[PDB]
């Protein structure tokens, strides 16, 4: 029953910023891996009929690890696109200006958070409870939904598997390149959703 | 200032099990990077003149993260060598037999926890305080000394950088290959010292 959601673009679509190779390993291997392990762990428990998010919300241990990673990855693929990147636009542009001063303030702060996360984890743009954009970081499979720290708008995966093929130990160049990939229309979809609450 | 202790072998001495390319990034980028970064963090601080192990035992935060990783990597490199691997011999052969039934019991339990570790971390063979060999796992920069959980005898790095170049997402092949590299002498020397107390 839990299926690996489809990419909205081709395996080559993020090149040269993230490679076709990477997306093959990250999506066809790692991401699919979390779906298959989750389906195994929940087959005959209370979790089998519950939704991905409910699982994420109520689970712990190995089930949460795989559940959250599935959700995190889907959010990550949708956080990017071909023909995306550069300056923001629409509502998210106006809110990033309001809540961080300027786009440039946000980008640098986000990049620094992304680059200094120790070990495996994620960076997030999130809407907190003051109806305010906020930069978070989570470790491993952690998630702002689980933490109740904010409603996700964008995410960027900082596990070594997300860049190691293309960038080796050079996380900073992966981060730089990711800005060419950021999908502002997903961000806008999420901000409108998130404001409704 | 703390230094990057030389390898006991050549860059390509662990191939084909761990390639020369991996060792180059793992040792010359990752491991050195931890050295340069710790030197800068302790520069003008109470720790500027303490030994690696004292910093490991006494600190937290980014300082702990870098010190612990220099230590954990040197132990990792010393845990391996060319013309090693295979069955254990001497004191470690015997104590493993006693504490786990047989070598194959240990190798399978140790492969399982090495493969099972979620996110970044380390597998350990250690002497616990009941004078018993046990398998420990630590997350991120953690080691058993800091944790007072045991005396390390052998370690194996599970961060994706340790294997991603050679094995991609296939952690289990890296662990299978690692068995061809296990330095039982280093193990023996550690058990002797450890058993002395
Ligand atoms: Fe990932
Ligand atoms: Fe490492």
Numbering used by the authors:
A (entry chain B), B (entry chain A): 1 to 197
Q: What sentences appear in the manuscript?
A:
Superoxide dismutases (SODs) are important enzymes in defence against oxidative stress.
The crystal structure of PfFeSOD has been solved and refined against data extending to 2.5 Å spacing. The refined model consists of two polypeptide chains, A and B, which are related by a non-crystallographic two-fold axis of symmetry, together with two iron ions and 140 solvent water molecules. Since the calculated molecular weight of the monomer is 23,799 Da, this indicates that PfFeSOD is a dimer, consistent with previously characterised FeSODs, which are either dimers or tetramers. The metal ion in both subunits of the enzyme is five-coordinate. The coordination geometry is trigonal bipyramidal, with His73, His161 and Asp157 providing the equatorial ligands and with His26 and the hydroxide or water oxygen atom forming the axial ligands. Trp122 forms a hydrogen bond to Gln69, which in turn forms a hydrogen bond with the hydroxyl group of Tyr34. Tyr34 is also hydrogen bonded via a water molecule to His30, which is bonded to Tyr134 from the other subunit. This classical hydrogen-bonding network in superoxide dismutases may allow communication between the two metal sites. There is an interesting pair of adjacent charge-charge interactions between the carboxylates of the Asp140 residues and the side chain imidazoles of His139.
